[PDB]
């Protein structure tokens, strides 16, 4: 009765960071081993838990959030961070317990000419609460004149595209990202081996 990690990690397409995916994982036994000695990740940063010492514990739920950002922004997927991603797209809590796994995916998510299927929110009046998802596409009003859903001066479509090109420097290349959150409340239904 294994946990469906590969469905998340090995997806063909990953979500846009502003519309990030969340896989709810429950009623299963988790082999974290496939993750933690894997050799194909470039970032694997855990907070308050070790991936080794999880097989003893049992959780009510695990959440696996996934999206694509550029390499320079991977450092923002961490407690206490700020920046366009942490403030307006995906926010971890200050007391976040779990793991941020990331890996370069230039070979899959950039096209020659540019891959503009990946979007981020550039404009937002205030910061996301932790684990907030904002999929609004309302024209953003940068001055006092309301926009009436029409683009123009001080009236901006809030999303921008990444335009990933395989020749970009590593910091401007696409990275796939999975965030593992652990929640216990309820009966514990996600368990490590033994």
């Amino acid at each position, epitope marked *: 009765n294994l946990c469906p990690f590969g469905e998340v990690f090995n997806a063909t397409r990953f979500a846009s960071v502003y519309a990030w995916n969340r896989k709810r994982i429950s009623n299963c036994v988790a082999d974290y081993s496939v993750l933690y000695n894997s050799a194909s990740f470039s970032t694997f940063k855990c907070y308050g838990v070790s991936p080794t010492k999880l097989n003893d514990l049992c959780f009510t739920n695990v959440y696996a959030d996934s999206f694509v950002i550029r390499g*320079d922004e991977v450092r923002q997927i961490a407690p206490g961070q*700020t*920046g*366009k991603i942490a*403030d*307006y797209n995906y926010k971890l809590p200050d007391d976040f317990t779990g793991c941020v796994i990331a890996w370069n995916s230039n070979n899959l998510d950039s096209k020659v000419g*540019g891959n503009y299927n990946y979007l981020y929110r*550039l*404009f*937002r*009046k*205030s*910061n996301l609460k932790p684990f907030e998802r904002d999929i609004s596409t309302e024209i*953003y*009003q*940068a*001055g*006092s004149t309301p926009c009436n859903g029409v683009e123009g*001066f*001080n009236c*901006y*479509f809030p999303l*921008q*595209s*990444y*335009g990933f*090109q395989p*020749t*970009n*420097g590593v*910091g*401007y290349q696409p990275y796939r990202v999975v965030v593992l959150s652990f929640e216990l409340l309820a009966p514990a239904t996600v368990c490590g081996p033994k």
Partner: antibody, heavy 117, light 109 residues
């Protein structure tokens, strides 16, 4: 749309100055607002930016000494400068940034800051 | 941080000619993150182009931005005496971004 700066003047090394930037036509609390400076005959230096949601960022050359902030009611952006050094001497502009959706399209007129004994 | 290196340091061209200004990034950033500005004596800078090629509002056709990766070009066609200024590139891929050091374009005569 106008941005108008004030508060520049002469100040001694180690001293403090607070720059002000009044805005009409954009809402400062809704925008990426920046401070960009230009030493005499030297080229633009982007020193600070404030995000609509409150996050602040600094160039390394002023990190620790300058604080960018705002007053949503006054529609005013501020640059609090401490431990001023001679190399801070420059004209300071505020500007509104749009990144991939526009330029730094609105700029102020400049206020001159001289750091000398 | 990303350094922008502009070239050459100065241009000097007759009215009607075409000026070619280069900007080289220390790292290949992609066209979305780059912009060009013009600063006339005693004025704040004025935006010309953003996202490498998108001309800003009120900016005539003579100003043309191009390039990708780490290399970008501002072309000013059909030069006039009024085009004397210092032109700057800027990258806003980081917070804050950075400006190139400027190319002064003198109008020959």
């Amino acid at each position: 749309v106008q941005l108008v700066e004030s508060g520049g003047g002469l100040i001694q090394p180690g001293g403090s100055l607070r720059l002000s930037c009044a805005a009409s036509g954009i809402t400062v609390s809704s925008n990426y607002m920046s401070w960009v400076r230009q030493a005499p005959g030297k080229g633009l230096e982007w020193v600070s930016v404030m995000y609509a949601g409150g996050s602040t960022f600094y160039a390394d050359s002023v990190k620790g000494r300058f604080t960018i902030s705002r007053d949503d009611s006054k529609n005013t952006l501020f640059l609090q400068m401490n431990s001023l050094r001679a190399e801070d001497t420059a004209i300071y502009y505020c500007a509104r940034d749009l990144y991939s959706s526009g330029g730094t399209d609105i700029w102020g007129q400049g206020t001159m800051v001289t750091v000398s004994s | 941080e990303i350094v922008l290196t502009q070239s050459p340091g100065t241009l000097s061209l007759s009215p009607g000619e075409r000026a070619t200004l280069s900007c080289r990034a220390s790292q290949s950033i992609g066209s979305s993150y780059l912009a060009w500005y013009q600063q006339k004596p005693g004025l704040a800078p004025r935006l010309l182009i953003y996202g490498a090629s998108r001309r800003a509002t009120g900016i005539p056709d003579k100003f043309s931005g191009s390039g990708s990766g780490a290399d970008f070009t501002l072309t000013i066609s059909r030069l006039e005496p009024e085009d004397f200024a210092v032109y700057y590139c800027q990258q806003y891929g980081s917070s804050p971004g950075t400006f190139g050091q400027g190319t002064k374009v003198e109008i020959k005569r």
